[PDB]
Each structure stands twice: as structure tokens, then as C-alpha cells.
Amino acid sequence: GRSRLLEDFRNNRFPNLQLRDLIGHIVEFSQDQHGSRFIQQKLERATPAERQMVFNEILQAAYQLMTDVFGNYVIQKFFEFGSLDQKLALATRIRGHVLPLALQMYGCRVIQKALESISSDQQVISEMVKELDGHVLKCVKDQNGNHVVQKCIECVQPQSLQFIIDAFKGQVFVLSTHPYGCRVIQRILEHCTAEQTLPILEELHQHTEQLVQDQYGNYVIQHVLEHGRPEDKSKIVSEIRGKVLALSQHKFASNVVEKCVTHASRAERALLIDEVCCQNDGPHSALYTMMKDQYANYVVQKMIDMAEPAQRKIIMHKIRPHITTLRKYTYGKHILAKLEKYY
Template sequence: MFEKNIRSARSISHIARGNVDPDDKEKEFSLHETNTQTMDKECTDIIEDAFNPIKCTTWQSKKNLVDRIEEDHPTHKSIEYNIEEKKSVLPPIGKGLKEKGKRHILLNSIKIDSFSSTPAAEPLKDQFFEEVYAFAKKRGISSSENLICAISKDQEGSRFIQKKLDGASAEEIAMTFEEICPWIGDLIADLFGNYVVQKFLEIGTHEQREKIFSAMEGTIIPLALHMYGCRVIQKALECKDINRKIVERIKGHVIDLVCDQNGNHVVQKCVECVDSDFVIKEFEEDAVSLSRHRYGCRVIQRIFENSTKCASAIDKIISNAKLLVEDQYGNYVIQHILEKGTHAHKRKIITDLSDNIAEYSTHKFASNVMEKCVICGTMEDRKHMLKQLKSAVGPSGEDMLIHITMDKFGNYVIQRLLDVLTGADKEVLMAHLKANISDLKKSSYAKCIISKLALLDSKRE
């Protein structure tokens, strides 16, 4: 065949050069036309064979445009656009975009509801997640496991997720929760991630809170002792549908938690939101020693505010008031009873302490309690305290009232007396101080007293 084509080509060449008889030209061209048609058919066959997917495995492995679109958008599948729809005024892409809630790229498509993949691979489904992913890209946050979890562990990312959740729909909240659900344990113990878990406890559904509880159920105590985990436990205790389950796991560990810098906050939250009875039962025997504890004193104060069943513990504390007033933490417990306790509790404390007001007023911690006694006491109590101060004499025979007025702690007690005394009792105190004004001027701590006396005199005029 190729030899015939070559001879035909040569014949044409001869004619072009004038080497062939003109009479034979018509025959030569007829032969040339036949050969050309034959060559065209042969070339077409060669091309078809080359691109036949059965005959050429290399071509078979290549992907067409539709295949590549399917890969780029795995949540959707292209569907055939039938002839009837082609007659529509709108083209396929226009018709596709009219359908609300679907994501159409170049071709008509349908959403694959069963599609599931990791956040890093899954295309964004709506504006909510588009903004989340855009934020991650801007902050340079990436994760091979869970992008939303990674964002939640970032300082700005945590704030961003919380803000987005505040304005999110129930569906968006549910989708976000499902993304972080496998990593809740990690987020609870994270510096910034714990706030995202707290947000879900606040705005989530009952089922979502149950899942959070399940994630931390076996580690309630370790989390309660954890710097960040204790915050999530406290937030969970505010949720009525799961808080009693948490309390059940705290029982028997109250003392350990009370004495811990993080755990004590969890016990305080138990007292405020759930139940204080089990707390009282566990530490009642140690009420006095816990009152002197840095963190225990806080829990006791919360119990006094929220329970009416702590009379036995209060009685033990009041019986040891003279010991506790001079303690750096115990004095706060006594002050709290004076402020929040019953009338009987106040009377017992003031009666026990007022006889030693001169001594306690110059003590760093006890002076705070004496101030509170002056403020919370009755007029009779105040008269009694003034009488004690005026009659008190120091080891060297000095006037204890003036000595206390010039003391760095005692001067505050005298200031409170000037504030609350009235009538003749106030006049007696002012007269005594004025009689010793020259001595008072020698002390920098008495300056406030001198100013207060001048102010009181000016109001009389």
C-alpha cells in the first residue's frame, strides 16, 4: 500500500516538473485522488487504534474532566443531564444553582448524604465552615487529625470558635461538636481548648452534654485537680442534667479536693449548685483544721452561705475563735460568720473576743476580726469595746488606746469606732484622742485619725 502511495507521489512530482505527457495527466490525478482517500482512511484507523481504551492501557489510566471534578468535590456526584432538560431556557449550571442548599460545580450534581471524611479533606459545606477554614488558613493552623480541634487549642482560635458558636444554628453546633467529640479529653485539659468545651456545655443539647460527661467520666478526680480541667468540671456542675452524676464521683474525695488549689473550686461549685450535705459530712470532723487551710477556709465560707445544716461545724469553729482570729486563714472564717451568721453566732464571737480587744487590735490578722466586730456589733457591744480600750494599760504603763491609734494595724480599729459610735460615746473617744494629739502627730499611722478628727469638728461648725 505504501509503495503505491510513494509511486503516486512520484507521479505527481513528475507532472509538476513537466516530465509526464499532458495527455496522461488526467489519469495520474485520478490515481492520486484514489490513493489520497486510501491514506486518509489508514490514518484514521491508526488514530482510533491509538486512542482505543481497550487497545491502549496508558490512555485508559488517564482521567477526564468529569472524573477530576468528582475528585475535587467528593461530597457530590455528577448526574446525567437529559435531553428534555437541555431544551430548558437555563443551561445546566444555571438550573443547578437555582436549587437551594446544593453545591454545583460546572455540572449538575446531587449531594451524597453518606459521604464522610476528615475535616482536612472534606470540602466546606456552608458559610460557617468556610469561615472556620479561612481562619485556620490565615493563622497557619493545620492538622492531620482534626482541624477544628487544632483551632480550639490556639488562643485566638478558641475565641473565634466560641464566638462562631454563639451565633450558630443548631445544625452547625451539632456538626462542630461531632468534629471535636473524639478529642474532648484533650481539649478539656488544654489551656485554650477547655473554653470551647465549656461553651458546648453552655449551649449544647442534653445529648451533647451527656457525651462530654462520658468523655470525662473515668477521670473526674484527676480533672478536678487539673489547672484547666477543673474549669470544665465547674461548668458541668452548673448543668442540672449531669451535675449529680459528677457529685457521685466526687464523694469520698472531698478532703483531697478541698486541700488542692484547683480542686477546692470544684467543691465550692458543688456546694453552690448541687449539694453541700455530702461535703459537710466528709469534713465536719476537720472543720477547725480546714479553717486554717489556705483553700479549706474558702470552702467553709461557701458552705456557711449555702447550707443550714452546718450548725455542728460552726459551733466547733466558734469554740476555737481565739485560735482562729490570729491565723492568716482562720481569721477570714471568723469574719465570715460575723457577717453572714445568725445573731447568736455573732454575739458569741464578739463576747469572747471583745475583752481582749486591746491585744487583738495590734495583731496583723486579729485586727481584721476586731474591725468586723465593731461594724457588726450592737451599740452595747461598741460601748463595751470602748470601755475596754480606755481602761487598758500597756506593759510599760502606756495608754493602750493611744498606742493602738499609733499602730499600723490598730489605727484601723479606732477609725471604725469613730465611724460607728454616736452621741456621748463618740464625744468621749474624740476627747481622749485630742488630749493626746501631740503624741499622735509623731506617728505616720495616726495621720488618718487626725484628719478624721478635723473633719468631724468641721461638720459641727
């Protein structure tokens, strides 16, 4: 039941209310949208004794607030402004309940806030992260849990995350096409050890042809091209070779092709470009097709940018006559710029 004090506050009868006046009422106010915003605001100016007064009360109902639409922000504010003993005490209230919280709309924010707020070497977060063991795939696919999984990878020591890696065994193809999985895979590639990522990268290479044309998979492949080891870059490039023209005209894979052109060796780059500028297969100039394609024109620009002088001259000579052509097409109207300021 709504106390008179909260009713009175919601009616603006206490225009200069001070945190101290909420003794006994902290939990009630935290579950109220306006009272919660009030407590959030005052915690940022509150003295330490005042924070502690509020803390003593929030600790008593911590789990309840953590899953509350408005109270979860009060909990988060102590992960922001509390001392370590306070944070650890609150995290103690998460422990035992990590899985349900991680799947809960509000609880999942609390968990991420703790992970960002408490040093990874503290026994808690260790205990907290292990609670996800046996539930990793369910969390990864969940709209709330997938952020919790990403935050663990971002904040915790990679060695303790071996269970996540094992969880992904044989699932890297499927999860890379997944709206959240692809994000989880990318955090793994950024944060885990070369030993842990070995099996991930293996499965990525196995399905590169399929992943470069996927709405989410294309991002995972680009990530390896931008941040991976050269030997993995080289593997992805070998899958593109022979398929430049087709993949260049593809909404998703066109992007992968650009990254291949950028991140390949000079030798590899030259062979990719050769496939476009200096070959003959059909009554059409591969370059002509690409120039004015909505997606491929971007690939052509990267090639012009990255080409050796020789290959660039040929690309320019083969575009030169098609000025009027380009004119009509929207997409040729950056290629034309480079042409004019080259001749």
C-alpha cells in the same frame, strides 16, 4: 501529625476560613492554640447546624480535649452556647472520670463550666458530684480541685452535699487556716442548711482565739460576723472581749475586731469600746497605743464611728491633747481628721 490544612491555616493562607471548611479537622484544630481560638470565635456566630457539625466531632474525642491545654476551651464553649442535649452529652463524657479531671489543670475548668451550665436537677451533675465522695479533703487541698469543690457547693442542692460536711468533721480548725479550705468553709456557710452548718460553726467557735489571728482563719471568722446568726456573732464577740488592745494591733485579728465593733449589739459594742476608752490598766492609755498603731488606728476609727455620743466625747477628749503626737505618725492621720471635724 500536623495536617497540611492546619499548617496552611497557621501560616495565614486561609484569612477568611469558615467553620464548615474544618470538617474532619475539628479535633486537630482544637488541640492547636490558634485553631482553638478560631473555633471558639466561630462558635459564637455559628448557625445551629454548624455548631452541631463541630459538636459531632468534638463529642468523639471529648475526654482528650477536656484535658488539653487548648482544647479544653472548645469544650467549655459548648457548655456556654450549646443546647441542653449537647451539654448533657458532653457531661456524660466527664462522668466516670470526675476525680482525675477535678485534679487536672484543664479538666477542672471543664467540670466547673458544666456545673454552671447544666441544671442541678439533671441526673448527671448528681452522679458527677457523688464521684467526689471519699475524696473531698484531697480535692479541697488541691490547687485545681478546690475550685471544683467550691463550685459544687455554689451550684448543687445542699442536701446532696452532706458527704462534704461529714468530710469536714474534726477538720474545720485545720482547713480554716488553709488557703483553699477557708474558701471552701465560707461557701459552706453561705449555701448549706442551718442543720449542716451547725457542726461547722461548733468547731469554729472551739478555735476562735486561734483563728482570728490566722492569715486565712481571720476571714472565716469575719464571714460569720458579717453573715451569721446573732447567737454565733455574740459567741465570737465574747472571745474578743478582754483581748481588744492586743488583737487590734495584730495584722489579721485587727480586722476581726472591726467586724465585732460593727456587728455586735449596742450593748456588746459599748463593752468593747469601754475596754479601750474607759478603763485603767497600766502606765499607758490603751487608746493612745491604738491611735497610732499601723493596724489599731483602723479599729479606733470604727469605734469613733459606732460609739454612742457619750463614749465618743470621752474618746475625743482623750485624743485631743495628743494632736502633736499623731502629727508625726502616719497612722494617726485619719484619726486626726475625725478629731478636727468633731471639735
